[PDB]
Amino acid sequence: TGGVAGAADITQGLPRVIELFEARRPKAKAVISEIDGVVRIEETEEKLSVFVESEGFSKEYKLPKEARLLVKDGDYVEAGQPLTRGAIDPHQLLEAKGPEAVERYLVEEIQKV
């Protein structure tokens, strides 16, 4: 779905149902949180950046210009939670929140349509 132009973010109709049954890398993906911790954001001109961290560790996340961020400087983000806005890659959610997560995401993301 969609077409390469400026910022076309999601995928509707059957096109999507295809992108869902067939595990695929959405056009406008959403970087998930491999780590369940707290949020931190930065200012510099070119690229934004969201950092998740626990008393254990922190992870750097590259969020280029188009990425509209759902999360804010401050609260917790469970593993595989949406840190970018839009679509998620099942494989990633598989690795992050688990199978049960992907499974549960697939079903519900499909019925959405």
Binding site for Mg ion (CB under 5 A): 6-7, 9-10, 12, 62, 72
Closest to Mg ion by CB, 13 vs 45, is 13
Q: How far is the CB of 74 from Mg ion (least distance, A)?
A: 7
Q: How far is the CB of 21 from Mg ion (least distance, A)?
A: 18
Query: Shortest CA distance to 87 belongs to which of 34, 3, 15, 16?
Result: 16
Closest to Mg ion by CB, 25 vs 62, is 62
Q: Are the C-beta atoms of residues 29 and 84 closer than 8 Å to each other?
A: yes
Closest to Mg ion by CB, 9 vs 23, is 9
Residue pointed to by tokens 């509707």? 12
Q: How far is the CB of 109 from Mg ion (least distance, A)?
A: 9
Q: Bridge-partner residues for 52, per DSSP? A: 39, 59
Which residue's Cβ lies closest to Mg ion?
6
Closest to Mg ion by CB, 23 vs 49, is 49
Q: How many CB atoms lie within 10 A of CB 12?
A: 11
Residue pointed to by tokens 């992907």? 102
